[PDB]
Every structure is written in structure tokens, then in C-alpha cells.
Design a protein around this motif. Structure first.
Motif, short mmCIF file in Angstrom:
data_model
loop_
_atom_site.label_atom_id
_atom_site.label_comp_id
_atom_site.label_asym_id
_atom_site.label_seq_id
_atom_site.Cartn_x
_atom_site.Cartn_y
_atom_site.Cartn_z
N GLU A 1 0.87 -1.10 -0.08
CA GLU A 1 -0.04 0.10 -0.07
C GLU A 1 0.95 1.36 0.06
O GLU A 1 0.32 2.28 -0.53
CB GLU A 1 -0.92 -0.11 0.99
N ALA A 2 2.27 1.20 0.50
CA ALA A 2 2.83 2.32 0.28
C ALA A 2 3.30 2.75 -0.86
O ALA A 2 3.65 4.12 -1.21
CB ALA A 2 4.11 1.95 1.49
N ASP A 3 3.56 1.88 -1.84
CA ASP A 3 3.40 2.03 -3.00
C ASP A 3 2.79 0.87 -4.12
O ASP A 3 3.27 0.03 -4.59
CB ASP A 3 5.08 1.94 -3.70
N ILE A 4 1.48 1.03 -4.39
CA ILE A 4 0.59 0.11 -4.80
C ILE A 4 0.92 0.12 -6.16
O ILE A 4 0.95 -1.02 -7.00
CB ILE A 4 -0.79 0.42 -4.63
N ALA A 5 1.26 1.23 -7.06
CA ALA A 5 1.57 1.27 -8.39
C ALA A 5 2.74 0.53 -8.82
O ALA A 5 2.96 -0.15 -9.73
CB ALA A 5 1.19 2.76 -8.95
N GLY A 6 3.85 0.78 -7.99
CA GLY A 6 4.97 0.40 -8.26
C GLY A 6 4.88 -1.31 -7.77
O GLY A 6 5.62 -2.31 -8.99
N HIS A 7 4.36 -1.78 -7.11
CA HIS A 7 4.06 -3.19 -6.87
C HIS A 7 3.31 -3.71 -7.91
O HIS A 7 3.76 -4.83 -8.46
CB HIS A 7 3.61 -3.40 -5.29
N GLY A 8 2.05 -3.08 -8.13
CA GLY A 8 1.16 -3.73 -9.30
C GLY A 8 1.75 -3.85 -10.43
O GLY A 8 1.82 -4.99 -11.33
N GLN A 9 2.68 -2.94 -10.94
CA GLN A 9 3.60 -3.01 -12.24
C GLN A 9 4.43 -4.02 -11.93
O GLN A 9 4.62 -4.83 -13.04
CB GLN A 9 4.26 -1.66 -12.31
N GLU A 10 5.31 -4.24 -11.11
CA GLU A 10 6.19 -5.32 -11.07
C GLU A 10 5.54 -6.82 -10.88
O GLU A 10 6.05 -7.58 -11.55
CB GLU A 10 7.24 -5.29 -10.00
N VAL A 11 4.43 -6.64 -10.39
CA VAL A 11 3.89 -8.05 -10.31
C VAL A 11 3.24 -8.17 -11.87
O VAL A 11 3.55 -9.59 -12.33
CB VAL A 11 2.40 -8.13 -9.53
N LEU A 12 2.61 -7.51 -12.62
CA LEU A 12 2.39 -7.95 -13.93
C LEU A 12 3.52 -8.13 -14.94
O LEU A 12 3.28 -8.89 -15.74
CB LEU A 12 1.32 -6.65 -14.42
N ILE A 13 4.61 -7.13 -14.64
CA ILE A 13 5.89 -7.58 -15.52
C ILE A 13 6.27 -8.94 -15.29
O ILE A 13 6.66 -9.59 -16.15
CB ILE A 13 6.90 -6.52 -15.17
N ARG A 14 6.36 -9.50 -13.91
CA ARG A 14 6.92 -10.91 -13.55
C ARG A 14 5.87 -12.00 -14.37
O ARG A 14 6.61 -12.77 -14.41
CB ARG A 14 7.05 -10.90 -11.91
N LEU A 15 4.65 -11.41 -14.31
CA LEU A 15 3.62 -12.54 -14.77
C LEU A 15 4.06 -12.75 -16.52
O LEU A 15 4.19 -13.53 -17.11
CB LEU A 15 2.42 -12.03 -14.42
N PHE A 16 4.07 -11.44 -16.98
CA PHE A 16 4.10 -11.35 -18.32
C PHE A 16 5.47 -11.97 -18.89
O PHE A 16 5.38 -12.63 -20.04
CB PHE A 16 3.72 -10.05 -18.94
N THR A 17 6.57 -11.67 -18.05
CA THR A 17 7.96 -12.15 -18.51
C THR A 17 8.14 -13.50 -18.19
O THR A 17 8.82 -14.45 -18.81
CB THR A 17 8.90 -11.06 -18.09
N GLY A 18 7.71 -14.10 -16.88
CA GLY A 18 7.83 -15.40 -16.50
C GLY A 18 6.74 -16.40 -17.48
O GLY A 18 7.30 -17.39 -17.55
N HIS A 19 5.63 -15.95 -17.97
CA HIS A 19 4.76 -16.66 -18.72
C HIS A 19 4.09 -15.82 -19.85
O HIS A 19 2.87 -15.38 -19.76
CB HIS A 19 3.68 -17.00 -17.66
#
Ligand code: HEM
Length: 152
Positions: free
Chosen positions: A18-36
Motif C-alpha cells: 500500500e505504500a507503493d501500490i502502483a510500483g508493486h502492481g507494475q512489477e507483479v504484472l511484469i513478472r507475470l508477463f515475462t515469466g509466462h
């Protein structure tokens, strides 16, 4: 089914996100898209992104990361009592987005990966255990609605 101690850990960890929701959300999606990469094909508005640099530069991807984690957070804050919150998400992902449950497994593990990456040494074993159980619960309840819908 989590204990109060475990929910406490989950919401403690969530305070990080929550301290950085956009930064975390971005990195989760990137990790998903590049992992799979097959997962990228389910998004008509991100399928154009071919490189991780373009992903990183995408304000709309960060925007969607915010939407996703905001929804997940709302669900997690319910501490398991999320039927009303979860039902429309299960329905839209089964019937409109056509997202197999396998991809929810993917993003669950991706969240775990991002937390360790952004908070090395600050995401303890007990914390990982609690977060993992919480994401399993989330996944399992979606899986139940998928079964109901006959969705594979
Ligand atoms: C923690 C797991 C997830 C959460 C909380 C979540 C939440 C959401 C929300 C709130 C929306 C917008 C409203 C809606 O369409 O229902 C959305 C849209 C969408 N989601 Fe998910 N989602 C998750 C996982 C996934 C995964 C793993 C995929 C595919 C690999 C996916 C694919 C999509 C797509 C394609 C859309 C529509 C995007 C658009 O065109 O606007 N979602 N999600």
C-alpha cells in the motif's frame, strides 16, 4: 483458512504494498508477463508490448496494476469473508476474460517473488507462509466458482 495471527501477518505485508501500490502492481504484472508470455495474450491492450522496457514504460500497465492490487487488497482485508467481492471477479475472469486457474497460480507466485525482490530480508518465512496461504484461499474460492461454471 487462516488464523488471526496469519491474517495479521498478511495485512502487515500488505502495508508494504500500500505504500507503493502502483510500483508493486507494475512489477507483479511484469513478472507475470515475462515469466509466462502466454498470459500476455489474454490482454488485448497489453499484447502490443513485446519488450520488458515497453512494459516498464507503460503508464496504462501501471494503471492496471493499481486496479488489480486494489481489488486484491480489498479482498485480503476481508480476512476470508470475501464472497461478495470475489464472485464478480470469478465470473468476469471465467466468462469474459477466459483466464484459466493456472494463470492465477502464476500471479500468486509472482506476488511472492516481487515481495522478496522489493523487500529482501524484510519478507520473513512466517510472512511468506501467511501470504501464500492467503493467495491459496483466494485461488481456491475462484476455482470453486470456475467449477460451477464448467470453465476450464
Ligand atoms: C490477484 C489476481 C487478480 C485480480 C485481483 C484481478 C482483478 C481484476 C480487475 C478488478 C479487473 C477489472 C474488472 C474486471 O474485468 O473484472 C481485471 C481485469 C482483467 N483481468 Fe484480472 N485480476 C487478477 C488476475 C488476472 C490474471 C492472472 C489474468 C491473466 C493472465 C487477468 C486478466 C485480466 C484481463 C485480460 C482483464 C481485462 C483487462 C482490460 O481489457 O481492461 N487477471 N482483473
Amino acid at each position: 483458512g487462516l488464523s488471526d495471527g496469519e491474517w495479521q501477518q498478511v495485512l502487515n505485508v500488505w502495508g508494504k504494498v500500500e505504500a507503493d501500490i502502483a510500483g508493486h502492481g507494475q512489477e507483479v504484472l511484469i513478472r507475470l508477463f515475462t515469466g509466462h508470455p502466454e498470459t500476455l495474450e489474454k490482454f488485448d491492450k497489453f499484447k502490443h508490448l513485446k519488450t520488458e522496457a515497453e512494459m516498464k514504460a507503460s503508464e496504462d500497465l501501471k494503471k492496471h496494476g493499481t486496479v488489480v492490487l486494489t481489488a486484491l487488497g480489498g479482498i485480503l482485508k476481508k480476512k476470508g469473508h470475501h464472497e461478495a467481492e470475489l464472485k464478480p471477479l470469478a465470473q468476469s475472469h471465467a466468462t469474459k476474460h477466459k483466464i484459466p486457474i493456472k494463470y492465477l497460480e502464476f500471479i500468486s507466485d509472482a506476488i511472492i517473488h516481487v515481495l522478496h525482490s522489493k523487500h529482501p530480508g524484510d519478507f520473513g518465512a512466517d510472512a511468506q507462509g501467511a501470504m501464500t496461504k492467503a493467495l491459496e484461499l483466494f485461488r481456491n474460492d475462484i476455482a470453486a466458482k470456475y467449477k460451477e461454471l464448467g470453465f476450464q
